Amino acid sequence: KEYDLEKLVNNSLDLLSIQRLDGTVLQVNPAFERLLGWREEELIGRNPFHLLHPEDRESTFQEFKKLNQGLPVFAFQNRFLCSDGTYKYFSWTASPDLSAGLIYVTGRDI
Amino acid sequence: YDLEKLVNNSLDLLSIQRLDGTVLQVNPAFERLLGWREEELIGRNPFHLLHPEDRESTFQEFKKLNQGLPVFAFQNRFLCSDGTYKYFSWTASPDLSAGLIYVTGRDI
């Protein structure tokens, strides 16, 4: 089963990610490399808020508080730094799992 | 599993089909975007919901999948439960050995 689901997630053009409640990235699909230019290994195991545009920090952290309170987030927009040194806009939809301590993230470039 | 929770909580359409088109698995996003319940899609070919003008192009893509070639950001219209056609962008990866196609979709 886990093989099939892996092929499903990895063949999405949209960003699919699993984070911890504190922000630590556990999983990313190849779409991140395609859209942001960063390799998987450079993102996994670390918090991504350092690629977050300074102006978008306050709003993004407020959304992360909501996730930590067990509220979903729909079509939230912020900017992430890409490997070419430019900021690109993304629309995020995030679903929290408090028992597992995870957040399930879907992202679209805009 | 964790990946299952990712698939089932995703805004994107995620589906597994057979090479002949028969739908084996569908995530809740299909119900959300197309209005159809899982039970009424599983086990069935979805080309019925395919807009007539998009049939020829979609079947050409399915031939490519059957030749083992992936398909990226292919756009067609599917009929929804409210009786309207909605636009989708599909990305499909074939697995000839398993006899499956991994389909990922986004509403346009």
Author numbering:
A (entry chain A): 7 to 116
B (entry chain C): 9 to 116
Structure paper excerpt:
The long-wavelength beamline I23 at Diamond Light Source overcomes these limitations and extends the accessible wavelength range to λ = 5.9 Å. In this study, we report the determination of diverse protein structures by experimental phasing techniques carried out at long wavelengths on beamline I23 at Diamond Light Source using S, Ca, K, Cl, V, I, Cd, and P as anomalous scatterers. Native-SAD uses light atoms naturally occurring in proteins or bound to proteins. We demonstrate that long-wavelength native-SAD has become a very compelling technique, where a low multiplicity dataset from a single crystal can be sufficient for successful structure determination, making it a general vehicle of choice for experimental phasing.
Amongst the structures solved at the beamline, the lowest sulfur content was found in the PAS domain of the protein codified by the locus tag LIC_11128 from Leptospira interrogans serovar Copenhageni Fiocruz L1-130. The domain contains only one sulfur in 116 amino acids (0.9% sulfur content), nevertheless the substructure solution was straightforward in SHELXD22 with 360° of data, a resolution of 2.5 Å, completeness of 83% and an overall multiplicity of 11. For refinement purposes, additional datasets were included, resulting in a final multiplicity of 49.2.
